[PDB]
């Protein structure tokens, strides 16, 4: 009911040599850089507001606690971006990034499009470390700006720290992305029409990501394809610790789960990215 | 309507705190059942008891947990006093050697408003009785004799017990810090 | 920062005598009828699937655990509706409903529209107990069906048990309502343009309810009203146990919180509905 | 106020050598193949229905007269597709297509994406004539189907005759495309975020094409770019006979008009496509 | 014609013990923290634009070269603030700041108001290092925000990096401050009515600072005070390398020059701040 | 819509214990000292000019009738200041000032700044009666003069009788203060950035006071704060007899009205100043 | 990115025949009369003060070195005006002015308003040479003085040598003009509301000229005109040697650059003024 690493490796080679495999990188991909995930941010927002971090967690979800933070005082969200810039893109996080085996194995492949939902320059920065060049696309001005001819386009799906208007963190910013009208939303839905995705270090907790894969099946089911042909183009979900409910929800959306070895999280991902080559 | 709620399932603790803090119209009463963590430290258990009782009732809550640290048992039970009196009822007077009967009766209030947990701790020196005596009160009151006094908590009335027990100093500290 | 019962009572009389107050009833309004809330359903779905009810709860949210239930076997959702009908609308739940002080105090007022998100005939059934007559509107055929002239229209916002196609319980049914295209969605957004609502027994946990109040502020903020005039039409949220984060999120959406006495939940609601008269 | 051919030629070379120019081909591009435009179809639908072709034209617009045709009898739209297939893709239209100077000049360039709104295999067929290979993408199954690595993708925006469910001709099919949810709609809106377009043989009469360029400016104006930077990425509209109103409407949408010589329509287009090389 | 360190020391003790001495700190005060001054920023802006740093310097003044940078591309100024935040407020600039003798000698005195024109948290950060607490005031929301009772207010006169809308760097932002209507402008002009200032590490090159001291003399000369009484309240300008023209311009504005020893710039400033105590 | 005395008393205690409350005293504060208000001056100017006091009032406003008085003859304004000195600061007005309950309740609080718009030494004289010491600041030479360390600064906003050049009474002197360039104007606009004010005995009839609160909202509205945060810092307007129009004009400018009991004007003010303590 | 002479010639004819073109003449317009520019004055001020002219230049800007000159001794500025009058308006500068092709081509056109920033009678003197008559307006008494009916008004924007109080040369005189309250300032800002200007021989180095064009865009941007209509009324900047930064700064202010041939400066200007006719 779940692919292993050796089973999923010839399936990922076929989609990569055809140029139809696109990585989707989450907050767990920057975990070996000693960065906060979605839980250590809330522990830092609770310290500023005067909450204990265990009491602040039980008043709402991740989107709702950041919405409460941003309206506590004026200019409270601007300060968070400034602080995150200092801690996510610091020089010691740069130094952990050249010697990271996941970021080396990611940049060794010749991708054309990479999607990320984390606010740090460590996915395009991994491509600059390997001598390659990348193109960060986050806002409308980036898509219409000049690029080079054949350069890997890194789509910052949730925003970048150097453009603080593009960061979606609060609940009102997730509701603004439910219209699927932002330039990262329109680019994602067109790439999903034709490409397989590889989710690495990401857990489907964002209700706007799950809503995009929902509405691709409304195109898939209305097109009245067979049992054989509607199940042909799959997406892949590499996860150490998926539960018992979530892999069966995603089978509806043509998403297969690749079970990685949970003893060493960083080496299991790196062996997956080296098996694509 | 009340603004603070004292949560206990023990109906004998309820009539003690209503004997002194009863006329305060800002204090309500709830009866949610929580599960304590396994630790002998009173400060650790009462702090994890308020986060587990705020999760149940979702209002500003006040919880209470005690300790009966004994010198002959190197501090045991501590905050593990609830399963000792269940297991050793009055044999607890017999498992302790005669001559080193000294013990501390500790007690702690912790109020949680949803953002902060503040712990108030009082403490009474004493010694375990040679045998259980007295009828009043409740759990382990026939075995504890405070320092200076000859009688137990069970032998004294509710006005006289609260002039020795840790709760009689915790009424005034809870009333002042909360404005009850 | 939070209205009491005596403070909110003249504010609710003014909107009721103008005919611009509409109740919105949740799952906590049927709690004195000894019915399951959103947690005792999941305890019943876990028993059918072979889970322990505490282990089944930590694999996903309420929408996602019901999505996992409905795809476990064919016709598994149809059986749930049948079981819910026998339990929610049973004869002993009818007998607890005439002697309930909340349902008597609700039906004593002369409402014109009532919205509910629960699957039971105990809101329109409370109106039949008081000699009044109601009109259940759940699907497209109900809105175009014949009614009488001046009859309280009960809008089953999440569906009814006698029309099992209208029940939204699983995650895919909540995503289908994100388009705001269903007939209860279109009727709600037009009533929200002109009326104050009174949320009784409901907690804002549905991301499609929160998204409707989100997009009413996008009309409110784009209309460029003043500080005084954009804050004039309020909605009211009666809740015994609102936390510390959620009342400040809803102040953005012109929703005021009415703090009820949590010692007796049923009598606190009944005194609120009697203060409107 | 309008570019000439020699003025627009260095502007089209710059966007083509960067790989950011995409042709958009209309019904006037298949006019030298002796095919009907949008007016000779209506003259053929009026003959079947028993109308005089001048009396049938004054009862509605092009979308509405085809909607009236399709509901006159059962299977009346299926017959039209069959008749169009025999007339549009006939062997004598193939023979006029190798010796057409526009189709030779189009296929001489190394495009990557071509959009068309006409129902004929004469744009991808022009690429097969030059030894190149093309990939027709019209439905959801085409986007998820297998292609080769670097092949010009011809996006049949309004459908293809070999897939009759994809043809949008009637008014109800244009209203179904107003949701911008079809796979050619989602691919167009993502390519418009990053690329210049060249409209050849197309007149903006489709209210779903004009609505896509409308909503790209709602992204452009909300992004609050300057006067200089919001006017940088232009689109180009080659037309022999644009009026006096329509070029000023399209200046709002960053669409520049290239005035071609109206004496010989086919040679003016061919000199434009040869100036890009 | 110029005060020495021992001559100016009893003049600074008298104004400090009366509470009427306010420091004004410039870009040279953060020079021992290895930060750029106004010339190494332009060397960094020229590298991004593709200029040689010596050729870029001769096309305009400091305000005008930053105006040219900010309009070269969209979001070009936002990136600069992000880069400056990671370079100015880095952890190695924090570590040089505790062992800096100027920042220790500044925080040893019990000031009430400090003005700075540099974008770094190293003046209020020096007060946090000495156990004291500071209050950064940069925007309108900071002045109306809550502070403590007796806390040194650090007025970021040109803006702060955690509030990027307050940074005045380009020429258009200096012209916007010529109206003297910003909250740091209004607070400065009222403190100048009653207090002596001490300029440390600042050179009068900003035409809005010089315009404020200009218009204080228009109040001083119109009030028709004597020769003795109009020259009583002085300001002090500590500078290692003032030229031959600028000290005589500032004598008009009651600004006296304190000549510091130019052999060691950091130790000369530290002996001045220790002589006030 | 209007605060009472008991409602506004905890709001004034909070701003006073933080040191952010500043009294603003008008001509009605010196009414129990049997002094003229703005109407009995005009009755005295009409007697000198040979007018009947009811006929002189209907030829212009208060500013314009004093402008007509000052240009009737040479040295006519100097005589008025001399006459006012004899009647406002007389010894019998001193004797009514120690036994006045408002002036005792004002001096019992430990203020730091007091603004007045009346020409009499009865606000700083009330502080000398309570053993405290005050510092009158009216002109440019007063702001740069020597004071003590922690002494309540009484800002004579419209001038003092011992400095007759500072008195603004005529229309030309109000127009000279529209530039907001005087030293009391610059000190007021900087204190308004950070402090709540308490208007006692003053009615907003001066068009230069209303223009200062106008331009503080132009800073407040351009800073784009929320509905919650732009309404946080309020000012207070204690008045026995405010009409129906003026309290709603001042709600725009964050000025709340405190309704005092109009039966006894002196005792209502004294109970307000005693409730702050 | 820069107009040539033949491109800008039909744009200048259209504004001239409508009477909406006004010349703005700088110090480079009097360069063929062998007069000092802004650099040879400073070489003459350095000789009087005892400086070497290369050492005097590096102590401040042009405004600041003249401020240092004027306060070196009493009556030092008046002597400079007397010397300038003897050198600038000498008889041999008159004789070079009739045979100058720029001054003949300027006076051949029928202007109505001419602005100059140089202190010499060679712009109105050029009009007297062509038989026309001019009206010099420099001070308040000139604007209210008598003129004839239709006579070209020459606005001496920085002053005239026959009225030495109007000359702005020192830094304190430029700061006095920042209020934009002088009669040449008020006349310029009203002519800029309705007219195109032609800058000939002037380089934007005066911070009060740049501040006037700054604040015309604050009217232009607040009026919320479109992209098309806010860019309609242009100003023109004829310059042989504009750099790389300054033409892009002035595009913000609707100022277009006309590149003249730098080989012969006098003949390039004369061909521009003859192309307007
Ligand atoms: O001052 C006291 N005087 C006499 N006996 C006491 C006292 N304080 C606690 N005790 C007893 C009661 C219980 O047997 C055990 C504490 O365990 P404890 O968890 O707090 O009791 P509980 O669970 O039944 O009620 P609750 O819900 O308030 O925790 O020691
Ligand atoms: N940049 C990150 O690693 C990150 C972590 C958590 C949330 N968003 C971003
Ligand atoms: N009918 C109900 O009471 C109910 C409860 C919980 C969820 N859905 C419906
Ligand atoms: N295939 C075509 O040329 C065509 C013409 C008119 C309308 N649709 C298609
Ligand atoms: N804060 C700084 O170091 C700085 C440097 C240069 C210009 N502005 C600020
Ligand atoms: N000093 C006063 O009472 C007064 C009265 C009227 C006007 N100005 C001052
Ligand atoms: N009169 C002039 O030409 C002139 C020259 C230099 C500076 N100012 C004026
Ligand atoms: Zn317990």
GROMACS .gro file of C-alpha atoms in nm, chain G residues 55-207:
model
  153
 1620UNK     CA    1   4.195   7.331  -0.222
 1621UNK     CA    2   3.896   7.559  -0.171
 1622UNK     CA    3   3.673   7.339  -0.385
 1623UNK     CA    4   3.705   7.029  -0.162
 1624UNK     CA    5   3.567   7.188   0.157
 1625UNK     CA    6   3.201   7.200   0.056
 1626UNK     CA    7   2.944   7.242  -0.215
 1627UNK     CA    8   2.881   7.551  -0.427
 1628UNK     CA    9   2.618   7.690  -0.189
 1629UNK     CA   10   2.841   7.636   0.113
 1630UNK     CA   11   3.157   7.794  -0.026
 1631UNK     CA   12   2.965   8.112  -0.109
 1632UNK     CA   13   2.816   8.111   0.241
 1633UNK     CA   14   3.171   8.095   0.377
 1634UNK     CA   15   3.272   8.385   0.154
 1635UNK     CA   16   2.987   8.613   0.258
 1636UNK     CA   17   3.062   8.584   0.631
 1637UNK     CA   18   3.439   8.624   0.607
 1638UNK     CA   19   3.418   9.001   0.651
 1639UNK     CA   20   3.146   9.266   0.663
 1640UNK     CA   21   3.017   9.392   0.327
 1641UNK     CA   22   3.188   9.103   0.149
 1642UNK     CA   23   2.875   8.989  -0.042
 1643UNK     CA   24   2.793   9.345  -0.165
 1644UNK     CA   25   3.147   9.376  -0.311
 1645UNK     CA   26   3.094   9.047  -0.504
 1646UNK     CA   27   2.766   9.180  -0.656
 1647UNK     CA   28   2.947   9.503  -0.759
 1648UNK     CA   29   3.235   9.303  -0.917
 1649UNK     CA   30   2.993   9.062  -1.094
 1650UNK     CA   31   2.795   9.360  -1.235
 1651UNK     CA   32   3.115   9.511  -1.387
 1652UNK     CA   33   3.219   9.172  -1.539
 1653UNK     CA   34   2.888   9.009  -1.638
 1654UNK     CA   35   2.717   9.316  -1.786
 1655UNK     CA   36   3.026   9.479  -1.937
 1656UNK     CA   37   3.029   9.644  -2.277
 1657UNK     CA   38   3.236   9.368  -2.436
 1658UNK     CA   39   2.981   9.113  -2.315
 1659UNK     CA   40   2.716   9.329  -2.482
 1660UNK     CA   41   2.909   9.320  -2.810
 1661UNK     CA   42   2.940   8.942  -2.803
 1662UNK     CA   43   2.565   8.922  -2.744
 1663UNK     CA   44   2.437   9.071  -3.070
 1664UNK     CA   45   2.650   8.835  -3.278
 1665UNK     CA   46   2.563   8.531  -3.068
 1666UNK     CA   47   2.350   8.284  -3.268
 1667UNK     CA   48   2.171   8.149  -2.959
 1668UNK     CA   49   2.054   8.490  -2.840
 1669UNK     CA   50   1.939   8.580  -3.190
 1670UNK     CA   51   1.746   8.254  -3.224
 1671UNK     CA   52   1.591   8.300  -2.880
 1672UNK     CA   53   1.466   8.650  -2.954
 1673UNK     CA   54   1.332   8.556  -3.299
 1674UNK     CA   55   1.049   8.361  -3.134
 1675UNK     CA   56   0.751   8.538  -2.982
 1676UNK     CA   57   0.767   8.416  -2.625
 1677UNK     CA   58   0.546   8.534  -2.341
 1678UNK     CA   59   0.742   8.419  -2.034
 1679UNK     CA   60   1.112   8.338  -1.993
 1680UNK     CA   61   1.269   8.210  -1.671
 1681UNK     CA   62   1.642   8.246  -1.601
 1682UNK     CA   63   1.865   8.159  -1.307
 1683UNK     CA   64   2.162   8.376  -1.404
 1684UNK     CA   65   2.251   8.728  -1.292
 1685UNK     CA   66   2.296   8.916  -1.619
 1686UNK     CA   67   2.093   9.131  -1.854
 1687UNK     CA   68   2.164   8.915  -2.157
 1688UNK     CA   69   1.828   8.740  -2.190
 1689UNK     CA   70   1.614   9.050  -2.180
 1690UNK     CA   71   1.901   9.227  -2.355
 1691UNK     CA   72   1.871   8.980  -2.641
 1692UNK     CA   73   1.505   9.079  -2.676
 1693UNK     CA   74   1.595   9.448  -2.690
 1694UNK     CA   75   1.846   9.369  -2.965
 1695UNK     CA   76   1.573   9.221  -3.185
 1696UNK     CA   77   1.353   9.529  -3.149
 1697UNK     CA   78   1.125   9.357  -2.900
 1698UNK     CA   79   1.067   9.481  -2.547
 1699UNK     CA   80   1.090   9.282  -2.225
 1700UNK     CA   81   0.985   9.319  -1.863
 1701UNK     CA   82   1.222   9.203  -1.591
 1702UNK     CA   83   1.041   9.064  -1.287
 1703UNK     CA   84   1.261   8.980  -0.991
 1704UNK     CA   85   1.115   9.121  -0.669
 1705UNK     CA   86   0.773   9.191  -0.520
 1706UNK     CA   87   0.780   9.551  -0.641
 1707UNK     CA   88   0.837   9.439  -1.000
 1708UNK     CA   89   0.530   9.214  -1.005
 1709UNK     CA   90   0.307   9.494  -0.879
 1710UNK     CA   91   0.473   9.757  -1.095
 1711UNK     CA   92   0.333   9.878  -1.425
 1712UNK     CA   93   0.404   9.688  -1.746
 1713UNK     CA   94   0.274   9.715  -2.098
 1714UNK     CA   95  -0.005   9.496  -2.233
 1715UNK     CA   96   0.157   9.212  -2.433
 1716UNK     CA   97   0.527   9.208  -2.341
 1717UNK     CA   98   0.749   8.907  -2.273
 1718UNK     CA   99   0.798   8.884  -1.898
 1719UNK     CA  100   1.151   8.774  -1.809
 1720UNK     CA  101   1.141   8.618  -1.462
 1721UNK     CA  102   1.481   8.647  -1.297
 1722UNK     CA  103   1.434   8.342  -1.078
 1723UNK     CA  104   1.752   8.380  -0.875
 1724UNK     CA  105   1.775   8.760  -0.879
 1725UNK     CA  106   1.921   9.048  -1.074
 1726UNK     CA  107   2.239   9.247  -1.029
 1727UNK     CA  108   2.057   9.581  -1.015
 1728UNK     CA  109   1.857   9.458  -0.713
 1729UNK     CA  110   2.123   9.298  -0.491
 1730UNK     CA  111   1.875   9.187  -0.224
 1731UNK     CA  112   1.720   8.939  -0.468
 1732UNK     CA  113   2.037   8.743  -0.547
 1733UNK     CA  114   2.037   8.391  -0.404
 1734UNK     CA  115   2.394   8.267  -0.400
 1735UNK     CA  116   2.480   8.161  -0.045
 1736UNK     CA  117   2.347   7.856   0.136
 1737UNK     CA  118   2.127   8.062   0.368
 1738UNK     CA  119   1.957   8.217   0.066
 1739UNK     CA  120   1.882   7.875  -0.083
 1740UNK     CA  121   1.732   7.765   0.249
 1741UNK     CA  122   1.518   8.078   0.253
 1742UNK     CA  123   1.377   7.973  -0.086
 1743UNK     CA  124   1.284   7.624   0.038
 1744UNK     CA  125   0.959   7.765   0.174
 1745UNK     CA  126   0.857   7.836  -0.190
 1746UNK     CA  127   0.715   8.168  -0.076
 1747UNK     CA  128   0.917   8.417  -0.282
 1748UNK     CA  129   0.740   8.587  -0.576
 1749UNK     CA  130   0.952   8.400  -0.835
 1750UNK     CA  131   0.868   8.076  -0.653
 1751UNK     CA  132   0.493   8.138  -0.656
 1752UNK     CA  133   0.494   8.239  -1.022
 1753UNK     CA  134   0.694   7.930  -1.122
 1754UNK     CA  135   0.465   7.682  -0.947
 1755UNK     CA  136   0.158   7.827  -1.115
 1756UNK     CA  137   0.317   7.824  -1.460
 1757UNK     CA  138   0.426   7.465  -1.405
 1758UNK     CA  139   0.061   7.367  -1.355
 1759UNK     CA  140  -0.023   7.448  -1.715
 1760UNK     CA  141   0.287   7.472  -1.935
 1761UNK     CA  142   0.574   7.271  -2.080
 1762UNK     CA  143   0.923   7.397  -2.004
 1763UNK     CA  144   1.239   7.387  -2.214
 1764UNK     CA  145   1.559   7.374  -2.009
 1765UNK     CA  146   1.849   7.517  -2.211
 1766UNK     CA  147   2.198   7.545  -2.069
 1767UNK     CA  148   2.080   7.444  -1.723
 1768UNK     CA  149   2.181   7.142  -1.517
 1769UNK     CA  150   1.959   7.035  -1.228
 1770UNK     CA  151   2.197   7.103  -0.943
 1771UNK     CA  152   1.979   7.344  -0.745
 1772UNK     CA  153   1.789   7.160  -0.474
   0.00000   0.00000   0.00000
